[PDB]
Structure formats: C-alpha cells, structure tokens
Amino acid sequence: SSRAGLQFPVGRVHRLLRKGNYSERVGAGAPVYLAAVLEYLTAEILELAGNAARDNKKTRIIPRHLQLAIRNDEELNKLLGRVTIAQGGVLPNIQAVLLPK
Amino acid sequence: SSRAGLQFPVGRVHRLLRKGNYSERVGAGAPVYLAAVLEYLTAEILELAGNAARDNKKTRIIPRHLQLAIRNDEELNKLLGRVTIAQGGVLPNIQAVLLPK
Amino acid sequence: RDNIQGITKPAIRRLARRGGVKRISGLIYEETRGVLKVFLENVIRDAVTYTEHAKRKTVTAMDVVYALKRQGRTLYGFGG
Amino acid sequence: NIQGITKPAIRRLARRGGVKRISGLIYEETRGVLKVFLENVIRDAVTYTEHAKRKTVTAMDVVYALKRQGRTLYGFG
Amino acid sequence: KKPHRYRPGTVALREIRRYQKSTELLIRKLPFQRLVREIAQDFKTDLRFQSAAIGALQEASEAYLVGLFEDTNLCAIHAKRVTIMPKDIQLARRIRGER
Amino acid sequence: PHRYRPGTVALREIRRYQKSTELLIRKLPFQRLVREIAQDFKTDLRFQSAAIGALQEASEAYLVGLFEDTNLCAIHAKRVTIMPKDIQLARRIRGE
Amino acid sequence: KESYSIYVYKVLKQVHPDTGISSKAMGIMNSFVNDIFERIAGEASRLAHYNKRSTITSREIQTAVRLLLPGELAKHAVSEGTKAVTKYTS
Amino acid sequence: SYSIYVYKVLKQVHPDTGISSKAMGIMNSFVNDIFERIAGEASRLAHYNKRSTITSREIQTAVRLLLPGELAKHAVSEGTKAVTKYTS
DNA sequence: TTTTGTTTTTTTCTGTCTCGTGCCTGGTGTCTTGGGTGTA
DNA sequence: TACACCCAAGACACCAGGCACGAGACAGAAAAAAACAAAA
C-alpha cells in the first residue's frame, strides 16, 4: 500500500483474491489495481456524502446522506441500480399532476 | 455414467467443476448430482419439445418447438424468464380488447 | 395467526405517501398486503434454505443478505 | 445509419408483439431506443474484443455481453 | 364560526413531503416481526431470528413497497387518474417481471 | 372492389408474425448500423456472421418485449393505438 | 470443441425414439445446459464459501438446485440426484 | 473490515466530517460487493481466454465492463497510476 | 341476398432420416496409498 | 475435536461404438380445385 500510494490494503486484497477461488494464479498488479479502484470509488462516494451533509448542516455522514449522494449522481445510480440502502429513504420527488391546479 | 444410470458424462462434469474455479476440492457425489439434475431437465425439455413437434406434424425439433414447450410451462418459463431463445418467436397471444365485437 | 393484518391501513398509507402517492383507493391495501406476503415468503424460503445449509437454528443477517442478493435486491449495511 | 430500420419493419416488430394500431411518432422513437440497446451491448462486446487481443467481434463476445446484462441468448454458443 | 378544514389534497401532499424527507421505518416492529416469524414457521418449525436479520428484512420490504408504490403512481398518472388502483399494481408487477 | 376494415389486417399480421419466427429486420441496414456504432468505440473492427445474427436476434427479442409492454400500457390507459409515452413508461418501469 | 450434443441426442432417443433435432435446437439445448451448469456451480461455490468450506459435495448441489429450480422441478431434480447418488455409491 | 481505510479516505476527502456506524457498514458492504463483482468478472474473463492467471488487464477490463463511462475511465486511470507506481 | 375468409382433398418433388461403414478416442479391469468424512 | 476406514486420483493395459461421409427414401409445403358457415 505504501509503494503504490494507496490507503486500501494490498496484501489483504491479494489474500482475499487468492482465497476466493477465482483463478489458479494471481499476479502482483491485479490486487493493486483492484485496491486503487475501490479507493477511488470510496473517495467519490464519501466526497458526495460529505457534500450532501454540508448541504444539510450535518457533520456526520448518515445513511440519508449516502442515499442522497448515490441517487443524485447519474453514474452512481446506474452502477447501484439494484442496490438498496438501509435507512436511506428516497428522493423528494413530487409529480406535477399531483400539485394543486 | 453407467454406474449411476445416467447418459450425461460424470467425468466431464467433474473435470469442468475442478477447472471451473469454483472450489479447491470437488466431492464424488456432486458431479453425479449435477449430471442427474441436468439429465432430468434435458429429458423434460426434450419430451415437451417432442410433444410440440408431434402437434406440428414434424419428426424434428426446431427452436419454435422449444419456445412453445418452454413458454407454455409455468415453472420452465419461471426458470428461463431472462432467457432469449433465438428463432423461437413468442406465444400467439392476443388481448381480448383488440378482438372485434 | 393471521399476522398479515399487522400491516394495517396507516402503514400502507405511509408507504404510499413515501412513494409519492396522493390518493389511495380501498382495494389497494389488500393487494399491497398480498404482494408483501408473497415477497416475504419468497425471501424467507431462501433464508431458511441458507440457514439449513449451515446446520443452524438461528437465521442470521448474513443469510438474509445472501437470499436478497441471490434474488435481485442487494441490501447494504448488514454485513458486520 | 439509423434510418435503415424502416417504419414497416418496426410495424412488423410491433405486430409480433401484439400491437394492433401504431401511431406516427413511435417508429423513429423506437429507433432511438434500438440504438440505445446497441449502445448498451456492442460496446461491451467491443470490450471483450479488446480483452482477447483480437480485431474480430466473435459471437462469444456478443453472448457474454448479453449475459452480463441479464439478457441471456441461446443458440450462439 | 366553522372550524378549519383542509380541502382534499393538501394534507396528502404534506404527508408525502414529510415521509419523503424522513427515512424512518414506516412499518411497526412488533407486527412485522410476528409476521416474519409466522412465515418462517411454515417452512421450518422452531426457528430463531436475530435483530439485524429482522431489521434488514424490514428495510428491504419497505424499499420494495416504496418502489412498487412509485410504479403504481406512475401507472395511475399514465392512465389520466390520481387515485391508485390494483390494476396499476398488477401492470407494474407484470412489467417488472414478477408476474 | 373489396376493402378491409381498419382492424382486420392488423390482427391478421399479428397472427402471421406470431406464428412465424423469421427475422423482421433486414440484414444489410442492421449490419451497417452495427458497424457505424462499433466504429465510435474502436476503429478497425471486424464482425462475424454469427455475431451479427445473434445481435439481430437479441435486438428483435428486446423490441418485441418492449412492444408487448407498450401495448399493455396502452390498453391499461383505455387506448388501442400505442404512443411514445407508453414506451417511456415501460422503459422507466423496467429500469432502463 | 467439446459439446453435449451426443448426450442430448441420447436423451431425446430415450424420451422419443422417433424424433430428431435440428442444429439450432441442438445449440439452444447446449446453451441451456451450459447456463444451468454455470448457475448451479456458482451457487454451490457461494454456498461453500459462506460456510468456510473448500469442498463441494452433493449437499451443496442439492441446496443450489432447491434455491434455483422452483417447486416441483426442484423436488424432481433433488429426487433424481439422490437416486443417482444412491445408484453410484452402491 | 474496511473501517479504518474508509475513515482514512474520508479524512483525506473531508478533514472535518465524521461517519456513523450504519454508514460505515453500508460503505463496507458496498466495497465488498464491488470486490466480489470485479473478482467474478475477472475470473470469467480469465476462463474465457483459457488463462489461469488474473493480472491488471483483467481487472481493468472488469472495471470498464462494470463501471459506466467517466467512472470507469477515472478508475482505470487510477489503477494504471497505482500499478505504475508499485512496479517502479 | 351475394361476395369473401376458412377448411378438405389428388400428386410431386423436397430437405431431410436412418442405414452402411472405417479410426480412434474416450469406454473398462487392476495395484497403491491416503485423505475426506462416519460415527462418536 | 478424535480414531477409523474405504473408494477415488494416478497410472498401466486392453478394447468398442460415435461421427461424418453417401444413399435410398420419407412425410410434407406447395401447386390447385373444390367445398361449407359466418361475416360484412
């Protein structure tokens, strides 16, 4: 992790890939790549959640912040389409035909 | 195959389960069970297809026969719900609202 | 016995208001309860199968997570 | 090349699905959707074509790209 | 003086906004737990359940019901109607692939 | 001379195209569109006949399913003719 | 290139001695067999990984069949698998 | 678990923002799901090419197939940078 | 009351179906030893 | 968690029908006339 400049563990990812019964041999660049991708995804999600929390005057990330960060982003909603977030709720979307005319 | 009374190969299934990156070790009854399940499913599907072909006056099985045999059965359609059959078509179902009178 | 009536009318009304439903009819609650019972049965069958495969008598959260993932309802926050 | 799918072709495709009457703003619209479908499949297959160090999109790549989205296709294995 | 009375449509949208802003569990805990235990008893008798498993089941059921209600409202609005009907739920469950 | 009523030929074509399982999309325009779309992703790409046939079959099946959902949505709205709003609602419910 | 065309033809002759099968139908049956094989193998591997088990036996395949196949199909497949295991062990 | 790593990533992207236990569990579940998906896609890609070794190319292909568009491009760039920094 | 979809009855070639048949590849006995369950 | 136990993985040696290459033929789509109930 220190040689690749990543916060996610490289040895743990390598051990998980070796014990997960995915392939006979595992290279040295695949765990680094997977850890980097996971770290980038986590960083994007956490930044969006922190922005949503700052928009609500909150200092702690709650599942509602994660839901608002995932649903507002198009790519994050496409990647997590069939993903359900517990205690996250939904978006405050009201149809125009239901408003008082 | 001859000892278990099945026409599907047991050694081939065992080799595919060993080299399929599923587990470190494969038991002795697992390939037999999987071959028996595959043989039962194939026998049911082929019997339904032969019945559909006899209902169509043909001594051969065409993709249309397979589609008419799978889509008609409830459990077979539930198992292959997200399965697209090439050159099979759809069921001749017309809604009652589109019918005259 | 007859626990399907636990999901009373106000619960279904709140669940509809969360989804953006303005007006609710009368025959909506029965169909909602039936669909909820069907979904609960479909999930609990796989959960009990996963629990019996582990030779256990207590349905843990991991079994429910696996049953929901094998169906198509990936749920987070219950893997710890 | 989106105009290749003629309007009577979409009419036949709708008749296969049990559609009695078809409007005028359907075909073109459906055409776009069709493009989206290709834009959700071919590219994925192209990725497979970029994984085997090949330049020809085989049927196995198309089958894998269709299975990876839940649209399992038979008769091309 | 006649007491205050809101016209049909105001409190409905108010409750919509209130339940869309908050993410609390709308289904009660004890009836849902009893229903889950009764359903699990039909498959295997004498079954124990943890709090996390029941909470995950309740969250998944609530999310699925919210999605189904969204689809039902969409189908009802598509049919030039405001009140939801079981036909909309049937159409939503048929298009989604459940039936 | 004879003249069919607006509704008989439609049902006849429905029955004819539901009984037969032939491809309803032409080969050359579909292949040209597939090549033009694949060119935007990677240049100098080749395609096999089996791959093009599989793509055509998958596209035809997806279009048939979408048209079935569209007809269902149109019938649910007390209508016979299909509209782009029906296709939009179907694609929104399906999650596309 | 290996395929289960011979075994599918044998099963067809067993269930229908006077009925053939086309090439496209044979390919569709091969794809169906491959898909069922892959699904059951993945489910068994997941069941083995969830229990920290590195061996896949008949119990894992039975659980995978009961989880994938619905109702009567699952029951008949489980019965056939148990019968085949009993015949092979004896 | 991935608790300390997620906390460090959050402190890197937001020095003045905390995280609850439920949010931490949700993040861990998301990380595990992405890990499983990418591992399965890489195993499938290796089995389709008659290969018994998963390298960085398989992970890159899995990321390009799973993640859509800009997310996939940025993840591929980050993975390539990490690989080039680790190999040097 | 008259025109048009739907169903029955001749051959005739027509894409296909099982028989005839050679090479070999995967279809069977036999020694060793041992590690995954059986039962406790 | 412990003691026991027995058929498979591996390997040697021996052996038999699939499968594609042709062929005579086999039930059937078509070509075409002729005929009854229901629809317009």
Author numbering:
A (entry chain c), B (entry chain g): 18 to 118
C (entry chain f): 23 to 102
D (entry chain b): 25 to 101
E (entry chain e): 36 to 134
F (entry chain a): 38 to 133
G (entry chain h): 34 to 123
H (entry chain d): 36 to 123
What did the study's authors say about this model?
RNA polymerase II (RNAPII) transcribes DNA wrapped in the nucleosome by stepwise pausing, especially at nucleosomal superhelical locations −5 and −1 [SHL(-5) and SHL(-1), respectively]. Conversely, in the histone chaperone-independent pathway, the histone transfer from in front to behind RNAPII is proposed to occur via the formation of a template DNA loop, in which the upstream DNA exiting RNAPII rebinds to the histones within the partially unwrapped nucleosome downstream of the RNAPII. In the present study, we performed cryo-electron microscopy analyses of RNAPII–nucleosome complexes paused at a major nucleosomal pausing site, SHL(-1).
We then determined the cryo-EM structure of the Spt4/5-Elf1-RNAPII–nucleosome complex paused at the SHL(-1) position. In this complex, Spt4/5 and Elf1 bind to the RNAPII surface. Interestingly, the Spt4 and Spt5 NGN domains are located near the DNA exit tunnel and interfere with the kinking of the upstream DNA, observed in the absence of Spt4/5 and Elf1. Consequently, the upstream DNA orientation is directed away from the downstream nucleosome. Consistent with this, we could not find any structure containing an upstream DNA loop, although the binding of trans DNA (foreign DNA) to the exposed histone surface was observed. Consequently, the binding of Spt4/5 and Elf1 moves the upstream DNA away from the nucleosome and prevents the DNA loop formation.
